[PDB]
Structure formats: structure tokens, C-alpha cells
Amino acid sequence: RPATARKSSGLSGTVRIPGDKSISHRSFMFGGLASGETRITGLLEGEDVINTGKAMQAMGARIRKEGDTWIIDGVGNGGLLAPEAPLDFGNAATGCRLTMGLVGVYDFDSTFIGDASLTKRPMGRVLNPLREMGVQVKSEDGDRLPVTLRGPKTPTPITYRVPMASAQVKSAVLLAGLNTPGITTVIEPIMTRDHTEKMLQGFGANLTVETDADGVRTIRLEGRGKLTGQVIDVPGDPSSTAFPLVAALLVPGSDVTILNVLMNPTRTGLILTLQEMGADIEVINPRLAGGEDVADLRVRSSTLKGVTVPEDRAPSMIDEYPILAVAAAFAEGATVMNGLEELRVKESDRLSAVANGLKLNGVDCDEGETSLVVRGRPDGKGLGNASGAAVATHLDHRIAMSFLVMGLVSENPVTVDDATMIATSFPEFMDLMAGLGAKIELS
């Protein structure tokens, strides 16, 4: 299902982006665990959230949705009730793993099952630390579902050095720490997404983060402490935010306000990069949501300037390299994006797709084994492709959307060989963008 974006006259509108999955998941989980009531609006009701909510309900949380608001009466930290049946996580690997972390330390049997897909996924990175806290683990093969957990009557807090920087493992251990007396500590070599830390604090947990000279982080959590209900308006998905954000910056005569933007630095490498590139992004109505920094962004057409993007920023914007590279195609000078680390543990996987799409669209860029270099053309002259040449998306929704955004600015249209994958990632993309005045013709 190819799609073509054509030069836009100027984007305008106020849009809200679908809630972030991670914050939605934690809001729902913490909402069910905390004492008191939590009200959530903007929830991304995806598999992880849904399945996690089902599990929280299975363990005593009272959940209901009224209007656009989910209302959760939590069981209180340490208040989880033994589930009467296995907790099926379908294909929600994240919801499954975090729930395991949360529940494994409870002194009741918990069985986790999932579909064929999730059942093949390794769980050991989460199961290992649970075992170290005293959890009895019964699992298949190389620690795969189905998994039965039974926490000890009293778990032991642990000081876990995440063998490998993982926000999820860190998250699983911290959640495990919640029902554990004493201080559970997670030490991660580099700061990874810290939504669990942020949201725990947002729910009243006694959690601190120490960072040493090397940036090594020591997250300490006082277990069995209180967690209390919160009013949470879930911030939007940063990666989805990226598109209208970049489109508004690039399409001249554009003035767009994006509501409820997550401003957590571990998720906003793109925004930070654009700001350095001189993006006219006005941060307004700053506030907190479940402990997360949130603001709305008033984005006006800007003249972006090339910058060098440090490899250490990549984690905070891993999925935004495609759209940043597109933004770079319209920025002054060159933009240098370093980090061959893992664009699939490669520096030519979909990294090549982006480079190729750019080239296909007249963009002067150089793809290396360590850095992608893009020399931009702010006025988009000569960019795009008048012959209708379609960018090979390689079933990558990020490439499809980034290049559709590109066509809103390039002198010549940009076509993507397929947009179907957009429905599976940011289905409201087409409507939101068209709503802003973007002209995207779908095959």
C-alpha cells in the first residue's frame, strides 16, 4: 500500500499523540498496586497495558473506565491477592516480564502463560534476579513460559548490577523490590529508561538514584513502602510525537502545538537533538504526570542546523533516527549521527534503508559503518522524487512515516512503497497529519 506525501503549505493544529506504552503500562500497574484510587486518562490500551490490567484485576485491583478515564482502586503495596488462574500475557512480553518482577516476590503461586510467540521468548533476565530474591521459579526450556512463580514469605532485597543495561530488567527488579523488606538496589552502567523509577516516585515510593562520576546509576528502592493513587494523564509516545513535531519544524508556515509530550530525557533524544539544531520548539504548560516531566510543545517552522549527534544519545532516541535523518535532509550543513552499536547490532540495517530512502530522494548523505552523515537543503529544492520512485520501507513503519513527513517538505513528492505498517504502529498517523494540513495520498 504505497503512499505519497506532497509539499505542504503550512501545518497547523493542536494534536495529542497516543499515550506512551511504557508509562501507560506502569500507570496501570502502579494504579492497581497502590493504596487508594488512581485515575488515568490518555492510556495507550495496548497488549501490555491490557494484559497487565487483567493481571492486576486478577490480583485484587478494582478497575473501571468512566468517560475517558480509567479508575483504579489499588490493593495497596504488598496487597496483591493470589490469582485464581494463570496470568495470560498473550504476546505482551513487557507486561509479562514486569508483572513477573512485581508478583514473583509475593508469597502465592503465580503462573504466567502467553501465546506461541511470547512462549519462545527468554525470561531468564527477569527470572534470575527474582530467584536471587528468593523466588521459586518453575519455567520451561531456557527459562521460558509457561512460568510459575512463588515468592518466599519474606524476600531478600538485592543489589543487582544489571549484567547488561536494560530498563526492563531494572524495572523488574525494582517492582520485585516493592514487596521486599529493606532496600533493593539496581546498579546500571548507563542510565536506561527510568519510567519505573520516575513513576514509583510519582506514586510516593521512597526511591533514589545516585550517579557516580562515570554515570553509573545506583537506584535504591525502599521495599514494602507505600504507593498511593495518582491522577495520571499519560504523556504521548515520544516516537509517534516525532513525526508531527518534525513535520511542523520543517514545513514552512507551520505552527503546531503537540499536547502532553513526555519530556523525560531518557526518551527525548530527538527533541533534544532538534533543539540543538535550533528547532523553534516552545515548551509550554510544563507539569508532572505520575512523576514524569510533561509539557506541550508549540512547534513552529524553523531553519534547522546540522549538528553532530553523540552515540550516547542513541538510546534516548533509538527509533527516531529515521525521522531525524529526514530532518537532517533539510538542515543547514551536515548532521552527523554516530553509533553503529545496535541498529540491529549493525550500522547498515534499516540504517541503510534510511540512507537509501534519503538518496532515493536526492539527499546528499553518506552512510558509514559508524556514522550517517546528511547534508541538508532547508528549502527542500531538488529533494523528493518527481518520478514517484518509492522508498523501500522494509516493513519499517518508522521509515514509512519519516519519508511521508519528508514529502511534506521536499520540492518533489516522496513516495513510500508501503504505509500498511503505519496502521500497526501509529494508526492515527494519517488522520493526525492530514488534520494538520499534511497532504498524504494513500494508494
**CA 407/CA 24 separation, integer angstroms:** 32
DSSP state of 75: -
302 marked among binding-site residues: no
Domain map (residue ranges) of the chain: 1-20+235-443, 21-234
Q: Is 414 helix (H, G, I), strand (E, B) or coil?
A: strand
What's the burial of 114, exposed, middle or buried (CB within 10 Å: 0-12/13-18/19+)? buried
List 319, 349, 379, 431, catalytic entry = 319
21 marked among binding-site residues: yes
Given a contact cutoff of 8 angstroms between Cβ atoms, the answer to whether 161 and 132 are in contact is no
Given a contact cutoff of 8 angstroms between Cβ atoms, the answer to whether 320 and 266 are in contact is no
277's torsion region: left (phi>0), alpha (psi -120 to 50) or beta?
alpha
Residues in the chain: 443
166 marked among binding-site residues: yes
**Domain 21-234: homologous superfamily in CATH:** Enolpyruvate transferase domain (3.65.10.10)
396 is catalytic: no
Given a contact cutoff of 8 angstroms between Cβ atoms, the answer to whether 309 and 338 are in contact is yes
DSSP state of 9: S
121 marked among binding-site residues: yes
User: Same CATH fold, 21-234 and 1-20+235-443?
Assistant: yes
**CA 378/CA 380 separation, integer angstroms:** 5
Cis status, amide bond into 322, omega within 30 of 0? no
CA dihedral (152, 155, 161, 162) positive or negative: positive
Q: Is 268 helix (H, G, I), strand (E, B) or coil?
A: coil
Rounded to whole angstroms, what are the CA distances from 424 to 144, 163, 396, 430?
26, 32, 10, 12
26 marked among binding-site residues: yes
First-last CA distance in the chain: 6
Mention the CATH class of domain 1-20+235-443: alpha beta
Rounded to whole angstroms, what are the CA distances from 408 to 4, 23, 94, 246, 324?
9, 31, 35, 10, 15
66-84 b/e (C-beta count within 10 Å ≥ 16 → b): eeebbbbbbbebbbbeebe
**CA 382/CA 361 separation, integer angstroms:** 8
> Judging by DSSP bridges, how do beta strands 334-338 and 371-375 pair with one another?
antiparallel
| Cα–Cα–Cα angle for 369, 374, 376, rounded to 5 degrees | 175
Rounded to whole angstroms, what are the CA distances from 405 to 38, 253, 276?
37, 15, 20
255 marked among binding-site residues: no
Shortest CA distance to 416 belongs to which of 343, 357, 374, 328?
A: 357
144 marked among binding-site residues: no
Query: Which position has the grid cell 484485576?
Result: 57
**CA 159/CA 186 separation, integer angstroms:** 6
168 marked among binding-site residues: yes
Half-sphere exposure of 182 (CA within 13 A, CB side): 9
> Structure solved using which method?
X-ray
346 marked among binding-site residues: yes
Query: Which position has the grid cell 547488561?
Result: 164
**CA 394/CA 281 separation, integer angstroms:** 31
267 marked among binding-site residues: no
